[PDB]
Symmetry: C2
Subunit: 302 residues, 2 copies
Amino acid sequence: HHSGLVKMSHPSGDVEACMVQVTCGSMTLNGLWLDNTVWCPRHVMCPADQLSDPNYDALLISMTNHSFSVQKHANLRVVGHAMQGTLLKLTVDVANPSTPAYTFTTVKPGAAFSVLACYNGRPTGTFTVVMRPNYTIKGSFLCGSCGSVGYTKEGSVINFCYMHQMELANGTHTGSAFDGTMYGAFMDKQVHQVQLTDKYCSVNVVAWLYAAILNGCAWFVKPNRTSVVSFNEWALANQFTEFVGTQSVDMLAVKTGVAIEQLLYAIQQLYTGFQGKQILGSTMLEDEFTPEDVNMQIMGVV
Amino acid sequence: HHSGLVKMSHPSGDVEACMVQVTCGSMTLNGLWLDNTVWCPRHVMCPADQLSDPNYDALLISMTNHSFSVQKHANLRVVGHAMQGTLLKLTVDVANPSTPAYTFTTVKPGAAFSVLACYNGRPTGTFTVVMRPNYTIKGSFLCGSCGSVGYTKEGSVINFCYMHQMELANGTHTGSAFDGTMYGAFMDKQVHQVQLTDKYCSVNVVAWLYAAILNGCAWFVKPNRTSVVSFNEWALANQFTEFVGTQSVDMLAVKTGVAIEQLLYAIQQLYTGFQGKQILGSTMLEDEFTPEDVNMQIMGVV
């Protein structure tokens, strides 16, 4: 029985109309054109032959407005340049007439967001990811994809949360918030960097087990219960995040009549082994679907 | 090590500008507005209290142009109505100024395509699926989503291949081609229908194993070989599709130096058990990624 659960992205049209190409010297990547501002990663200033441990403060000073070329696939004349953390803020002379209603925000581990992968200012695909507990995402990014953006949507308002910067040695990806900070302890330097350990997102595992119940698959449900506090102590020893419930999890508990604390116990047992049984066609726990995804795609509740 | 492989959809903007709401009597669903034509599922004519085994020929005759209301979220005046298989073809007085370059086509089992899920003429998410060997897809569709469309893209040209019609008892979905035929032996009737058995898509499994090698995971590779002909005889007895190679598979064979016939042997062995080992973090074979996906997302080859 198919769960009805898929990796679902926001429609990308509104963001598509905001993507531009930014070139500086030997380097080309993507930017995001909102109002009179173009945001892009600051390593566009960096000579393609010196991306290792660059001095961005000095590269910045060396640039003038004419050092930047912004192109929509039109030329947008740059009339101002600034650096905020790991991002540039270029002011251009034309405001984007397709600028949507938007905010900036910072996404938290466990939460999902949509990504528009672009090359040369040209959108090429969209996908959705969860921010891992070690502040990477498991994306699909190649050379020339920096500046691609990740975003959520609430109603008509687009909440930009991510601008892609780099790949780590283990094939996962990270980038910046639009306040210029990198997610995690990462730096936009092409050198060896420690990576924090990943973890299962307990809340998303709970969501997944609820999805299974909503699909009639409930063999893992016993009357036994672990409290939230005792789960969280267990979790620290076991590479799960600590669980923090939400209203969306409460809704699932109500629709199913199965308590969070019964699924926490179930997780503790399934972690040691499924024992031949499957769950929604899987033999390991799934933490890539959020309580919100389950509520929306299975129950029609946004 | 993350493969770099994700479920990737085309950017949806071009199709978003083609979606409308179609209402007839008690029923509302989505349509696709290209040129002066709006396509939508024919059960929009069916009284919401009689969707079981309807007589569409008689419902059709009972309609006039004013029986249909088309709305873009504008009102498009209907000046012609026709039925082609399981689809209506409404002619409207305004041509869609955002009509992209397009074709119609029919997607084949194993092949991937992007879906724009809409409700009330309003796009709400996008995702990508593979056409299963029993001519269902594992989608995420609720009431009011009929008329959502699936499509591929070649360059700038959008190839429409699917208009959503129904959910089956096992939670999978099917619909029509734009020639009006349903995929498989399905009928657009809300009654019990046999369902063919699903199968692993051998070609996509081969793609997946190649992806694993490209990510450094090659323990399942032995010098042993099964020919294509002997695999295909095995496959019929084992709920795999018969394998049919393509140029995109040949490219992967060349990049890796590992022959198709070595991975066919590997599949025959992994089918009986992985034996504790994993493959790209999975303990079962994966057939949701195509040779094209692997070439594009891992190697930069379209």
